[PDB]
Amino acid sequence: PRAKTGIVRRRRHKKVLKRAKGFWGSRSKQYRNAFQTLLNAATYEYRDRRNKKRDFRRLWIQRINAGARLHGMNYSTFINGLKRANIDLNRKVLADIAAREPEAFKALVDASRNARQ
Amino acid sequence: PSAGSHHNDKLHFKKGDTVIVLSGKHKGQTGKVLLALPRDQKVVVEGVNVITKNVKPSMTNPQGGQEQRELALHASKVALVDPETGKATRVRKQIVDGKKVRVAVASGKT
Amino acid sequence: AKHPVPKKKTSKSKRDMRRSHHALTAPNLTECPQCHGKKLSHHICPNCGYYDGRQVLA
RNA sequence: GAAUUGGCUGUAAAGAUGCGGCCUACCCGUAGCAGGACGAAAAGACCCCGUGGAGCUUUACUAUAGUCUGGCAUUGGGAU
RNA sequence: GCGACUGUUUACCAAAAUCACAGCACUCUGCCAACACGAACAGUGGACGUAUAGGGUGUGACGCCUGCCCGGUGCCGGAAGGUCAAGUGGAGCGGUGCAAGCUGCGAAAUGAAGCCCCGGUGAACGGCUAAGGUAGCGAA
RNA sequence: UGAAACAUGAUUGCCCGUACCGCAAACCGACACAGGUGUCCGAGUGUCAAUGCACUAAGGCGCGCGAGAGAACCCUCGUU
RNA sequence: GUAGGGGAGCGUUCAGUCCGCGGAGAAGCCAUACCGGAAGGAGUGGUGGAGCCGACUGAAGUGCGGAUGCCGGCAUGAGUAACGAUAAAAGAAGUGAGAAUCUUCUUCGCCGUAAGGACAAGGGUUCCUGGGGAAGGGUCGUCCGCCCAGGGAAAGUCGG
RNA sequence: GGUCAAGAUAGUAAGGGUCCACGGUGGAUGCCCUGGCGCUGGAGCCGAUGAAGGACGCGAUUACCUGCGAAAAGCCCCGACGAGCUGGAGAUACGCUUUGACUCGGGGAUGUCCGAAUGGGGAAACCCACCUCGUAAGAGGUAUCCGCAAGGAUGGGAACUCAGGGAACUGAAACAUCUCAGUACCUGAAGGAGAAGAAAGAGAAUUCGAUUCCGUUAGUAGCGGCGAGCGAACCCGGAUCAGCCCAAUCAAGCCGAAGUGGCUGGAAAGCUACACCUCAGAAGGUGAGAGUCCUGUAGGCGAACGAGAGGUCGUUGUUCGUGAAACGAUGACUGAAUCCGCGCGGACCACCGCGCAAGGCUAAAUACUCCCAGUGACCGAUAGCGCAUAGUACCGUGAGGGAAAGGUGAAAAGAACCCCGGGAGGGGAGUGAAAGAGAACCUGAAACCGUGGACUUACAAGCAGUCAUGGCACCUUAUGCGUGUUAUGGCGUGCCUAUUGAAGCAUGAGCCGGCGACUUAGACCUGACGUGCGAGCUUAAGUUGAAAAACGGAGGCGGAGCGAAAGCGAGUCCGAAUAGGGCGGCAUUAGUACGUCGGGCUAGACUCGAAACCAGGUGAGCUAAGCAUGACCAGGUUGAAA
């Protein structure tokens, strides 16, 4: 018996061509280019998962030394204080305190200054 | 393309017979057979009636309105009736005419 | 061969952008002071054949 | 191939619109000009390669049409 | 300069100093000619011609001219001899059978054109070891 | 013994071709193509002659996109 | 983790078997934010209008982005180059749904050893009349060598 | 509130972008069959009484096809059928038919012109004759080769058969013997088959008993630049089965059993309730799915009158390549015996054994498939034949080459009438279940072209994404969940190929759809898995039954090795007996058939691509020339010999 492609390819093709959403020009309309775009998208996808994790910590650190410097300190110094006050092991959350709770952030600056000098 | 060979260019009626229409619309309705087309498998009975339009400009006056005429059928009418309904056929012999073979079933009249 | 030739197909975008000036400007139609069918400024009214008096037949 | 298709200096497979850094630049056309897009066109014609091909040559090899030559047929009789 | 001349050529990048040419030469061909086409003792061209003719090859009107080398190669010629095929000729060696027989191979001498060998030949291939350029020309 | 030849009467008169295009928009060129195609006729005036050249009879035709404009440049020309 | 070797599977057509579904709507197509570790699979809705899913087993013309791949459709260049000899053309009148282009009149201009006329070859009805107006006509046609129907071609002496 | 200043920020969209809605284009996909392919079986020649294949005709109307043949879509006779018919034809008019039309089965009768073509010519289908009979019309004859004459032959056949002649590419990783291969091709002869055939044989048993075919022997024996590679036969099993003569039942066709009501539906054949038939539940049709509605099926009947010698030289065949080369075969030369005779047995001799050449026929088993029937883990419109029909259109001077194209509806009920328009085209009305079927008629993907809406974009540097956050919008697997879109930030060198090294300014590619590449074969080899028997395992060809498998033991593999071989044998080989090779015991375990998979070999061997080589044919309508016969060269100048 004969077993022509019929239905299999078009379905295979529509799947790809639907991942292609706000894809500019041919990248959303023609299969070969839509599919091709996705290979490169795969690189970006797998990489950006572990990248966001560097991206955020960066943002986190930036907010910390901003507030640390508001109370005559800095990230390097502040963190060492909290480290030297072993009791203090915030690390995660610490950026939100600086940004939302200034009263609370000050307390932790004052504790960090002790454990150091 | 094929056409009415599925039978044998063979009917079960004559251009005179009274027949009942089994199947479809016009079910049970009876009438005389006025046209029998064996190869085509067509029956013109006083049954199925149609309203045919006339595309007639030059053709004998432009007054080509609507016409009352009956439209042909197949084997969607069971041939020959006497006990008030449709039947098969089985008993042949001769009447006064030997050469002729009649038809009949659970009864004996056609 | 056919010496200077296009390098890449021009996209549906790029092709369309070039046509942003191809739109016809509708005639400034005036209404005839007589026959009351519309006409072109500085021309004889098509309908009556007037241009103060009647110049053209019908 | 698809294009949302700038300049300088770099770097990169060693001649970058698509990488880095700096610079410049509102969106879109029309008429034009040929520097670039290693622009188009013909699966380099040079060059090398393939135990690839064909045309030509000769005292390359092997055969061969032709042709020269001994024998046997067709093919006989007499003299030395 | 080149080619004497009119002429001919690369349909579609070469028109020429290319080819052809009149003229000159070497040469082959005696007529069922040489030579050519062809399955072919067919047939035909050569030619319904006949050496003042026909084939081939070269040079290329006309003028004055065309030298030296015959070793190599080719062509024509001679033959004292050497070399050479089938065949004719069969001396010998060998197989087998008890035997006549039947058999396997086989020398010498004889056996053709060819080739080596000798002479010739240049408007033969050639050269300037077989000789080393006669006129004329020469930075073409 | 009714020849050939002449003369005048009658009778007889087979088959294929004939339209049209035919230096072309009807043929060959894939097209209604600036090429190609054998023969014949081919008037007048002027100019030694002529089938040359200019104009023109008869006859045929304005070439199946058109209209503005009056740039660069490109083609074919005139003058310098 | 490339060549490569090994393992487990998804999907397509056909087949045998079983369970079924379907004109109160099958396949196919279309949309989707659901499921599975992946190939993939389901729900709902929309179209369609007569056939078909699931499970096991069997067999293959069984899975495509590439081959200057093949067939077909459609884009780009782009409303761009061109519209085929630089022998012109003008107005009037007519016709018609419609006219630069068709008819007619008056002019103009180009050929005139031809761009006139008569054969031959070759072509085949292109001829004439009356109609037409899709497509052909490089534009437009009311017109045509295009389309439809009717007609036309005449030999003892001309060619054979 | 107002003026001035300083800041910041919104909205505009010529046009674009993403998404959504609706369309157009196009013809994928699904469904279908009107058409093909393969295998199985049947059947198998036509023609001078004029074929195969054609030209021109024949219609009331006729372009194409069909059928026919001036007696022309038909004429006569016989049979069957029993009411319709007037070809496809979707088309009106005229008619024909129970004094039996039509159609089907079987005969006849007419059969123009061409074609073997056949009176002669010829550029097929056209010219031109003569002779006999005849009232003109019209009829018959006139070709050569066989034979007295009757009567036979010319020509055509897809493949198959034998014969004459006979390549090269290719393998040999070059090439030359060799291979491809006596293949392809040409030519001849013939038939439904042919060929071959009745032992001067095979051959080693003093077996056999015509030929062909199949299995097997067996990749054995052997051939071989002993290379690539080529490759028998006897025995045995099987299909079929003969030896004779001379010379001295199936087509036409008829009969054929049994369901009714309600329901859903446009429509019942489906659903439901009770019912029957079955020697028939195979199949097609009927508005949807059918035992009981039609055609049929099982079963039965059935036709007037219809088929079933030796030699030398040269070479060669088969495993046969000059080998030790026998034997056949024959171009050249020679040339015997006649049964106490001849030929053979692989140089050759003798012995032993097999057989009678120099005359002819001979069925069956075998092969092929133009055609016919049946069937299918064959195709279903880019598939399948090239064709759902066409060897057409188109291309070519010719030989030759060569397409694509399917689908209204159940039924034409094919849309009267109205409206815009010259028309085309549409909108209605009506028909229909649906016109979401309207004749560019099933579905109607995608590329591609549009209209409308949402969010957006005119200081911007860009492999076009990706991650994060904010803004706007929306709520049918879908309200914490997202979905769409959008601003800004970060990050970010298309894909494939080829490659030490690809974004590469290296290759390929306009886009989409479909088509498109590791297969198949063999009683082949070797391995993994698996099963069945197991020291044993297994069938091949065939035969008989076939809604199906059984039989068939010929043969193949284990079962003993070692050697060059004789041969010997758990031993055997070198050798003269002692060292060793290979084998056995091994301490010792097993195979064989079929299957699926890995791999190998042989074939086109994963697909696509040469330049070229060979065979037979087509072309000098172009162009190079030759021959025959015609045609042509205005006008002017110069001024040779005589």
Ligand SMILES: CC[C@H]1OC(=O)[C@H](C)[C@@H](OC(=O)N2CCC[C@@H]2c2cccnc2)[C@H](C)[C@@H](O[C@@H]2O[C@H](C)C[C@H](N(C)C)[C@H]2O)[C@](C)(OC)C[C@@H](C)C(=O)[C@H](C)[C@H]2NC(=O)O[C@@]21C
């Ligand atoms: C006149 C049109 C005619 O072109 C020519 O004839 C010119 C003159 C010719 O130039 C030439 O052949 N030549 C020969 C040398 C002078 C001239 C030349 C070359 C380059 C540029 N310009 C001129 C080409 C440019 C030449 O290419 C050149 O080929 C060279 C082999 C290599 C060059 N490369 C490096 C760029 C390439 O361009 C080729 C080979 O053609 C013939 C090109 C191929 C594609 C071709 O056949 C075309 C289809 C060709 N045939 C046709 O009908 O139309 C064309 C286009």
Ligand SMILES: [Mg+2]
């Ligand atoms: Mg330019």
Ligand SMILES: [Mg+2]
């Ligand atoms: Mg000269």
Ligand SMILES: [Mg+2]
């Ligand atoms: Mg000259």
Ligand SMILES: [Mg+2]
């Ligand atoms: Mg102009």
Ligand SMILES: [Mg+2]
């Ligand atoms: Mg102006």
Ligand SMILES: [Mg+2]
């Ligand atoms: Mg592709």
Ligand SMILES: [Mg+2]
């Ligand atoms: Mg289809």
Ligand SMILES: [Mg+2]
């Ligand atoms: Mg056919």
Ligand SMILES: [Mg+2]
């Ligand atoms: Mg390369």
